[PDB]
Design a protein around this ligand. Structure first.
Ligand SMILES: CSC[S@](=O)C[C@H](CO)NC(=O)/C=C/c1c(C)[nH]c(=O)[nH]c1=O
Ligand SMILES: *C(=O)[C@H](Cc1ccccc1)NC(=O)CCCCCN
Ligand SMILES: [Cl-]
Ligand SMILES: [Cl-]
Ligand SMILES: [Cl-]
Ligand SMILES: [Cl-]
Ligand SMILES: [K+]
Ligand SMILES: [Mg+2]
Ligand SMILES: [Mg+2]
Ligand SMILES: [Mg+2]
Ligand SMILES: [Mg+2]
Ligand SMILES: [Mg+2]
Ligand SMILES: [Mg+2]
Ligand SMILES: [Mg+2]
Ligand SMILES: [Mg+2]
Ligand SMILES: [Mg+2]
Ligand SMILES: [Mg+2]
Ligand SMILES: [Mg+2]
Ligand SMILES: [Mg+2]
Ligand SMILES: [Mg+2]
Ligand SMILES: [Mg+2]
Ligand SMILES: [Mg+2]
Ligand SMILES: [Mg+2]
Ligand SMILES: [Mg+2]
Ligand SMILES: [Mg+2]
Ligand SMILES: [Mg+2]
Ligand SMILES: [Mg+2]
Ligand SMILES: [Mg+2]
Ligand SMILES: [Mg+2]
Ligand SMILES: [Mg+2]
Ligand SMILES: [Mg+2]
Ligand SMILES: [Mg+2]
Ligand SMILES: [Mg+2]
Ligand SMILES: [Mg+2]
Ligand SMILES: [Mg+2]
Ligand SMILES: [Mg+2]
Ligand SMILES: [Mg+2]
Ligand SMILES: [Mg+2]
Ligand SMILES: [Mg+2]
Ligand SMILES: [Mg+2]
Ligand SMILES: [Mg+2]
Ligand SMILES: [Mg+2]
Ligand SMILES: [Mg+2]
Ligand SMILES: [Mg+2]
Ligand SMILES: [Mg+2]
Ligand SMILES: [Mg+2]
Ligand SMILES: [Mg+2]
Ligand SMILES: [Mg+2]
Ligand SMILES: [Mg+2]
Ligand SMILES: [Mg+2]
Ligand SMILES: [Mg+2]
Ligand SMILES: [Mg+2]
Ligand SMILES: [Mg+2]
Ligand SMILES: [Mg+2]
Ligand SMILES: [Mg+2]
Ligand SMILES: [Mg+2]
Ligand SMILES: [Mg+2]
Ligand SMILES: [Mg+2]
Ligand SMILES: [Mg+2]
Ligand SMILES: [Mg+2]
Ligand SMILES: [Mg+2]
Ligand SMILES: [Mg+2]
Ligand SMILES: [Mg+2]
Ligand SMILES: [Mg+2]
Ligand SMILES: [Mg+2]
Ligand SMILES: [Mg+2]
Ligand SMILES: [Mg+2]
Ligand SMILES: [Mg+2]
Ligand SMILES: [Mg+2]
Ligand SMILES: [Mg+2]
Ligand SMILES: [Mg+2]
Ligand SMILES: [Mg+2]
Ligand SMILES: [Mg+2]
Ligand SMILES: [Mg+2]
Ligand SMILES: [Mg+2]
Ligand SMILES: [Mg+2]
Ligand code: NA
Ligand code: NA
Ligand code: NA
Ligand code: NA
Ligand code: NA
Ligand code: NA
Ligand code: NA
Ligand code: NA
Ligand code: NA
Ligand code: NA
Ligand code: NA
Ligand code: NA
Ligand code: NA
Ligand code: NA
Ligand code: NA
Ligand code: NA
Ligand code: NA
Ligand code: NA
Ligand code: NA
Ligand code: NA
Ligand code: NA
Ligand code: NA
Ligand code: NA
Ligand code: NA
Ligand code: NA
Ligand code: NA
Length: 237
RNA sequence: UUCAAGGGCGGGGAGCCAUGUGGACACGACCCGAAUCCGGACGAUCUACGCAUGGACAAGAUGAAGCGUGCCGAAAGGCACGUGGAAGUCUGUUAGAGUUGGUGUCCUACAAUACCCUCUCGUGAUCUAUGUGUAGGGGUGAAAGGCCCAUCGAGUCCGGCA
RNA sequence: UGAGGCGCCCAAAAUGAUCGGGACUCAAAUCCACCACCGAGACCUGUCCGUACCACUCAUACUGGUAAUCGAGUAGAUUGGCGCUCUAAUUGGAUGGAAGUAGGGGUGAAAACUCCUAUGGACCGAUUAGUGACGAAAAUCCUGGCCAUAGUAGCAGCGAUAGUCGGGUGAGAACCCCGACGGCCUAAUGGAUAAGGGUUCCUCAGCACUGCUGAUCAGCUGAGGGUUAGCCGGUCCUAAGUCAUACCGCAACUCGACUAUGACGAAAUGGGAAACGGGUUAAUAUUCCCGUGCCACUAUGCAGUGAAAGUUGACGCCCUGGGGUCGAUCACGCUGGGCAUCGCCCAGUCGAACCGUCCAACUCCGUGGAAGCCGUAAUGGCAGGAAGCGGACGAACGGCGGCAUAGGGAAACGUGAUUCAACCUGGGGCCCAUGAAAAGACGAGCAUAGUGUCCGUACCGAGAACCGACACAGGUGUCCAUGGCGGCGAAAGCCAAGGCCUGUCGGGAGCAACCAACGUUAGGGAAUUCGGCAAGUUAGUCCCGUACCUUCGGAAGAAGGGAUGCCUGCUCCGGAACGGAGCAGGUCGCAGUGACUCGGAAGCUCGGACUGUCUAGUAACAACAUAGGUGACCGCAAAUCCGCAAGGACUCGUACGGUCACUGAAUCCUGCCCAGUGCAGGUAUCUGAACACCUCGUACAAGAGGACGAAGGACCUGUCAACGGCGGGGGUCUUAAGGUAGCGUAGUACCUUGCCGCAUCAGUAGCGGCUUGCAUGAAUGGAUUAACCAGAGCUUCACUGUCCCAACGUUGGGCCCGGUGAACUGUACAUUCCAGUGCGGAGUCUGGAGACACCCAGGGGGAAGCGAAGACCCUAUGGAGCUUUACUGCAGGCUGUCGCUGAGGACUCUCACUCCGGGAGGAGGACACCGAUAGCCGGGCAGUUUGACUGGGGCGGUACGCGCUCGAAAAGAUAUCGAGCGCGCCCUAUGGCUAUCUCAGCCGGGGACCCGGCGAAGAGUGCAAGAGCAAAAGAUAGCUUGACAGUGUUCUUCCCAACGAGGAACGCUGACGCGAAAGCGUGGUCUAGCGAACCAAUUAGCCUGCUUGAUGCGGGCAAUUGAUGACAGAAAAGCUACCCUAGGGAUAACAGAGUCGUCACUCGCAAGAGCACAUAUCGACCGAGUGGCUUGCUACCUCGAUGUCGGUUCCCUCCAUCCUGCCCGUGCAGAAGCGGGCAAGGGUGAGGUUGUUCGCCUAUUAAAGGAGGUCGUGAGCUGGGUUUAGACCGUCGUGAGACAGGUCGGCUGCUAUCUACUGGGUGUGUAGGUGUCUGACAAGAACGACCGUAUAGUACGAGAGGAACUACGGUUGGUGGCCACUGGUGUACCGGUUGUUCGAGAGAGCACGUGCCGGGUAGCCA
RNA sequence: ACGCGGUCGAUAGACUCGGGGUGUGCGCGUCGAGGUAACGAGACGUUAAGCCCACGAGCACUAACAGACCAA
């Protein structure tokens, strides 16, 4: 047959690419020689086309002007600080070690200095639970308990824009406009509505999948469709 | 070969070469005849989808939130009138897009998809120009096996190839 | 009373009867005899030829002879010869005329040779030996040429119907030019342009080409000429993105991703330093000229030290205020024009860039001091300081002044106003959407001077300059959206400016038939049809009023009712409008949204929630999408995906993420099942590869085995919003469960038109209820649902030419004429018709009939008409796309091992290596990555296979290898999906031999046993069937292993007649068994019980392996065992409705043909009943037939195609008669019937469900008969069904996909050559004329039928009831004609009136070929 | 193709009658709700008016002229 849609994706053609050229900034923690002295002033609050969430423009003492992954509650004028000795208030960034356990955090680094990887979407947050001289245990929004180097920097507070998911799109048109701001092919045609040549679920006098939908982890691309390595399906039990 | 016996093959000198010709086998193999398969190339001037930069949508209808005033109320708020002007909202041959019926006209056509009447959409998932990207078991596809220059259940060109 | 001969009855078929025809009757029939004739290529006979043979001969050269016993022939074998090219030898011809060609003479059986005449004007042969791109009627053959077609189709159809009269030029004028008159185009048919074209632009000269006719014209032909820029574009900048170099990959590159650098990337339409006005040319123009202005750079000079921070460039969608120019309009004045019953109507009234100046809005400052005020269209503002007041900053393509005793105008060369595009400047709202960048400019003065190069510039920009082969009705972007009336309007209609008469052939006929578009049709009003398809109705605006249902939004313009003009005078809102809303009075018409513009309405049911998407070119839908619901994977060095690699998408992203799937808004819900399959987790034990390790083996090695054991599997568990499942039986079984809520004859229900009800005269429809559901059912989602819909079905009102039933009219064709001028098609012949025959579907054969030739128009019956090597079906050891637990492999994922790889069955470390960090350093770490390999998964991908037979193929079956009886025709051989039935073993004895013996069955004496008798064979002999066997081939007993090794002969397998394995018969050699011995034993009494090569294992001996010896391990001679049952041996599944090719009528579907079991009808016999009575009537059994309508069979005809069902329309026919006429019987009183006979003249109708044929149903009726014509009729129509591609449901399948199951949607080509007929002409024949006739023959249905009255309340009859002959009146159907009457038309005509234009008036044009409305003559019509 | 007439003529046209179709012309006069006036839809009269006719009659005014040909 023909390569299935999931395979066209990888080639990275226009249709599957994100409108990068239309994006604003790659949100990452600033680099500080040391000392922490680094502080700056919120100059404005903008909309981030890549995350459908607000972002804060900040002017730093040493002249640097960069957009920042804004937590909820940051306003123009506020003074943010980044470093080991940063005060402990929302919007400030400092290593997990210097952060008091029990405090909600966002934009957490996977490894010290990577600029933040975890908890960055609308209204989410990580939860610093345990400290140590060797391991900082954080609970990520997925519920998992992650062990991190206490040297990993983070931002205090939860990400701005919480509750975005609460309102339904209501109409195809709204999805449309959102989708146009992401690296995604939309709308979605069901495999079972295709021809046998286009998808392992395609074909038939009526619409139904050919075999069972749970596919092995070892299935090859072109065949790995449906419920991938499902440990279970349905809702019962 | 065989204890033995019995069988198999061969044996009392005709071949070799040349020329014509009959026939066999491989090769295009008397000649034409078809749907393939494979290789390397050429195409997104059509069209599909995405991107960049521009452009387009008479007029009318309905009257969401919000806000105002007045009345009622302890309050909560409620009621009336106005204001406001929302909507993949309505009417609409505005422009523009689409293509339901007539199974009309045409059917050596005006035309290798046309004409007329009728009909759908017409502020949006809208229409459109130009630029630009994706290439052949690959694209592209709101999925019809649709579309990729009158060519698609695997484009076109030449070659493999007689 | 028996028999015979001939005939008669029995006896019905579709265009015109038949014996070939005529026709025949003491025969021209039939039978018995007879006589004479005709009649083949046979037979006889003369001559000749060929072939074979004989004699003679070198000869196959002659000559002679023989053939009663020689003379046909497709495929094929054999043999002699003719012609062509060029070579060679030998030898000839030709300018006193070669070859070739045309016509003609002679020879040869013939291929072919030769001559003569003419033409031609330079080459040409013969013999012999060679040579070969050597011979054509054919291939839907190739190329070229040519005829018919035919002076035919087209040059008409499009909402753009366009011309006419004069004149000019010219050889020539319908279409070239001038004038007038008349028209066409208004977002275009006007003006400016992008792309694209490329000289098409202008001038002159032309007409051979092109131009749908002509041409003096031209986008044509030829020759000249034409495009002028500091301030318009390009150029410069950067966008999506592209390239180049470097780096790295790759076997390699012209290949490839990333990262650097550089460059490229916008001419209408991104950003951007600067130009305006006038004039000028045949053709350019913000470019030239005149005038005026401006920008940038540089130089000089004065000023200035400022100078880079900032601003700008620079930005989305929706609503809106303010400023404001042009335009348009209004008022008044001036200038010019038009009109002439008034006094109106039209045009103009001008004047730039630029320089200077003014400034609303926004923002801000001071003052002020609001506790309720300020303000808006709206939101809003304020003690954090409202209003007011004063001030800073600050806009237009705008005002104002200059520019300008510039320019322009014949002149005047105005002033105000409203509404205000452009342009300027604000306020508000929206986002799960956030709406470029860079160059540049500003910031940052002024004088003077110099410089400002390079490229583009013509023209078209489209119903003739672009793309579409064309001067193509198609396609093709931007700006002018402000010209007038109109009105909501960028709408219609009408009209300016501007353009055009080139959507480029004309002339003629009241102009017929027929066709395209269209108008109007009385009465009826969907009766039409699959269906209201098509058409029609309704319509604008205001007032009143508005149901069920509902997601409260909607439904809704529901429905329904009323109003609507003009004129006079007014009121209200507002600053006002040349804006809007009303009032009073007057008044005209059939009609006041008067044209135009402009909804028909209501209800029930099905589907999908909605807007949206789709099969460019037969499917717009219920299909796709969607929000919403749900499950799955993943913590980012991720999940998923692309790449060979280097690398990459997702990702400027981070679980409120994004990937992979299912369902498909809302509402109420979503039961049971984990056995199979899938996925996932676990796992004592079992299984599980390679490396390393251990054992054996080998001086090593191959090799065999062990130990250990990863993923995986077994096993266990979880999981169904995972594939999917939810039955039979009883008051459990398969296989886990055993169908819950709902829904239900469904778009799912076979039976089926289910039953009941609604509705209708009548309802296979529709809706409601019931419902056992062939075969409903829960995210394979169930139910239900407001709103929405070019989605499917149904009902009502309204409407109407859909119909009854057609008519008249309008326009363009058609017809005739001038000009232009194709194509399809053509084996030949052809004036046919009826029958027959023939490969069974004939213009051509056979017999008859008819037929004088040619031509014009027509509608298409036939040429199984033209078009297309059938797309259905089968066949081919064809193709492709698709599927899967088909075969075989290949990617990819998981896992063990080795290398990178290091230190001290679990562990630490650091140094490689990887990742994070700018670095320091941090994390990880001998793992991971990468290279190599092993095991598991692995339709993600590739190549293939998936057999044959067959009353087509499939399904079923195996007649696919074997044995027997019969078929099989008394030798042998012999077919079918022929009839009966068997074999794929079993046996150590059930083999072999010898001895002894005789069996079944019956009888008699003491079903065991014993005795006697009869007893040729019926017993027994392993197993089919047939055969054999009695001192045995059987039984009993004993002994034995011949069921032995080796090797043959022969038969069979395979008749004849080649072919292997296998089998058998009969020998020999050797060794044995038993017997006294002869002898028997080559397995079972005979015919079934079987298997190649390659490879392996096995048996005994021997041969052999590369210079040589030893060892190991190989190679071989002979043979046994292991299987190919498709059995003379491949290793092997399906779908295609997306399909494709080669073919086949070798083979199916419709139709034809044959048959006639079936079907229809009849006859013979007549049991029987019919109160008695076979035969008034009904009529079994059985028997004999006829038809060719049904159904089946067959496979003859057609697969280089004979278009399907039904319907429709139009024609002919049959009779087995439904009605009508004439009759017979009756269980015939009458009336009404029942049955039968003759009879085909005429009639046999309208409707409701259904695509139906058929059939059911209703009301009428004299009756509402059946059948044939290719199941008549698609070069006639329709297209509802069947039967393509889309989609759904149920069932089946793992799946692709399947299902005379259902369902929605789904195309109808062609110009008539011949023939046929309907009508019209021209000629010839009879043989100059006028007029009038005749009548061989031909056609008719020209008439069919019914009702009523008198007869008559009569005959008959108890009565009830109730005729007839005859005479009358009328109706219906059909037929022919006609228009006084009624009616239709009547784009003749006359009137009314709306909009607009001509100034009003008068009088007119347009509004589609009448604007609309009202009336309507003639004619034509019903 | 057919039929009729052709000056010894009524065949076609013009004109005038007759017979028909519409429905009362232009202009002028009077009235007219009103309005200072300007103006004024419309009513009545003149007016069975005006306009029109594919038919008939009268009527030689116009045109059926001129003339060609075939023919035993
Ligand atoms: C020869 S072309 C005419 S078609 O063959 C006509 C005939 C009957 O007249 N129709 C059929 O044979 C139809 C058969 C069908 C079959 C076998 N199966 C189906 O599913 N549908 C059918 O129509
Ligand atoms: C069945 O009768 C087939 C159906 C079909 C076949 C192919 C494509 C679509 C439908 N019909 C035919 O075979 C008709 C054949 C016409 C032959 C005419 N000469
Ligand atoms: Cl989303
Ligand atoms: Cl010869
Ligand atoms: Cl330009
Ligand atoms: Cl405002
Ligand atoms: K056929
Ligand atoms: Mg980033
Ligand atoms: Mg919304
Ligand atoms: Mg996208
Ligand atoms: Mg979908
Ligand atoms: Mg599909
Ligand atoms: Mg597949
Ligand atoms: Mg479904
Ligand atoms: Mg499904
Ligand atoms: Mg393009
Ligand atoms: Mg309002
Ligand atoms: Mg809309
Ligand atoms: Mg609309
Ligand atoms: Mg399909
Ligand atoms: Mg012969
Ligand atoms: Mg010689
Ligand atoms: Mg031949
Ligand atoms: Mg013809
Ligand atoms: Mg048109
Ligand atoms: Mg016209
Ligand atoms: Mg010219
Ligand atoms: Mg000229
Ligand atoms: Mg550039
Ligand atoms: Mg530009
Ligand atoms: Mg010009
Ligand atoms: Mg120009
Ligand atoms: Mg043209
Ligand atoms: Mg009518
Ligand atoms: Mg009907
Ligand atoms: Mg009917
Ligand atoms: Mg219709
Ligand atoms: Mg007022
Ligand atoms: Mg239904
Ligand atoms: Mg829909
Ligand atoms: Mg289509
Ligand atoms: Mg549609
Ligand atoms: Mg369509
Ligand atoms: Mg759907
Ligand atoms: Mg979803
Ligand atoms: Mg029902
Ligand atoms: Mg369920
Ligand atoms: Mg064929
Ligand atoms: Mg097929
Ligand atoms: Mg294949
Ligand atoms: Mg890195
Ligand atoms: Mg495959
Ligand atoms: Mg192959
Ligand atoms: Mg077969
Ligand atoms: Mg025999
Ligand atoms: Mg024997
Ligand atoms: Mg083998
Ligand atoms: Mg063995
Ligand atoms: Mg065989
Ligand atoms: Mg055999
Ligand atoms: Mg084919
Ligand atoms: Mg046949
Ligand atoms: Mg035919
Ligand atoms: Mg009879
Ligand atoms: Mg008859
Ligand atoms: Mg038929
Ligand atoms: Mg018929
Ligand atoms: Mg026909
Ligand atoms: Mg047809
Ligand atoms: Mg035709
Ligand atoms: Mg159909
Ligand atoms: Mg249908
Ligand atoms: Mg079928
Ligand atoms: Mg259908
Ligand atoms: Mg003669
Ligand atoms: Mg008109
Ligand atoms: Na499927
Ligand atoms: Na192939
Ligand atoms: Na393109
Ligand atoms: Na409101
Ligand atoms: Na259309
Ligand atoms: Na391809
Ligand atoms: Na080739
Ligand atoms: Na022969
Ligand atoms: Na012309
Ligand atoms: Na819409
Ligand atoms: Na299960
Ligand atoms: Na399971
Ligand atoms: Na089910
Ligand atoms: Na729609
Ligand atoms: Na009509
Ligand atoms: Na015909
Ligand atoms: Na295919
Ligand atoms: Na096979
Ligand atoms: Na043998
Ligand atoms: Na018969
Ligand atoms: Na044929
Ligand atoms: Na038919
Ligand atoms: Na009759
Ligand atoms: Na037929
Ligand atoms: Na038909
Ligand atoms: Na047709």
């Amino acid at each position: 047959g023909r390569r299935i849609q999931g395979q066209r994706r990888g080639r990275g053609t226009s249709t599957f690419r994100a409108p990068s050229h239309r994006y604003k900034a790659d949100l990452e923690h600033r680099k500080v020689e040391d000392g922490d002295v680094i502080a700056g002033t919120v100059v404005d609050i903008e909309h981030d086309p890549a995350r459908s969430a607000p972002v804060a423009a900040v002017e730093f003492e040493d002249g640097d002007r960069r957009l920042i992954l804004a937590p909820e509650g940051v306003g123009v004028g506020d003074e943010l600080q980044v470093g080991v000795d940063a005060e402990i208030a929302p919007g400030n960034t400092l290593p997990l070690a210097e952060i008091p356990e029990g405090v909600p955090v966002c934009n957490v680094e996977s490894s010290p200095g990577d600029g933040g990887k975890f908890a960055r979407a609308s209204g989410v947050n990580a939860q610093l639970l345990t400290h140590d001289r060797n391991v900082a245990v954080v609970k990520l929004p997925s519920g998992e308990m992650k062990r991190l180097d206490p040297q990993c920097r983070a931002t205090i507070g939860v990400v701005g824009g919480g509750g975005r998911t609460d309102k339904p799109f209501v109409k195809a048109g709204n999805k449309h406009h959102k989708m146009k701001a992401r690296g995604t092919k939309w709308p979605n045609v069901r495999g079972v509505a295709m021809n046998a040549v286009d998808h392992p679920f395609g074909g038939g006098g009526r619409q139904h999948p050919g075999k069972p939908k749970s596919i092995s982890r070892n299935a090859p691309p072109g065949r790995k469709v449906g419920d991938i390595a499902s440990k279970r399906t349905g809702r019962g039990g």
